[PDB]
């Protein structure tokens, strides 16, 4: 399903999706 | 970018995979 994710909620989802691999959080 | 689109619009978990290492 599509997601509406702002602020810390986006970082939560990135953590869930990427887990061990890690991720970059890069807003503008 | 995605930080913008997920919040101002919607985004999928599949789009989020683009940001994994
Ligand atoms: Cu909240």
Residue numbers in the entry:
A (entry chain B): 2 to 29
B (entry chain A): 1 to 21
In the authors' words:
Hexameric insulin binds two metal ions by the coordination of three histidine residues (HisB10) to each of the two metal ions. The coordination sphere for each metal site is thus completed by water molecules, some of which are weakly coordinated and easily exchanged.
Primary damage, i.e. photoreduction, was followed directly by XANES as a function of radiation dose, while secondary damage in the form of structural changes around the Cu atoms after exposure to different radiation doses was studied by crystallography using a laboratory diffractometer. Hexameric copper insulin is found to adopt the T6 conformation in all of the crystal structures reported here. At higher doses no significant changes in the coordination of the Cu I site are observed, whereas the Cu II site is seen to change with increasing radiation dose. Compared with the evolution of the electron density in the in-house crystal structures, the structural changes around copper in site II seem to be detectable at radiation doses of around 0.1 MGy and above. At 100 K, disruption of the water structure in Cu site II was detected at doses above 0.1 MGy. Thereby, the radiation damage to the water coordination could be initiated by the photoreduction of Cu2+ to Cu+. The water–water distance also increases, from 2.00 to 2.35 Å, which indicates minor changes, in site I. However, these changes were only monitored and were not explained by the final models.
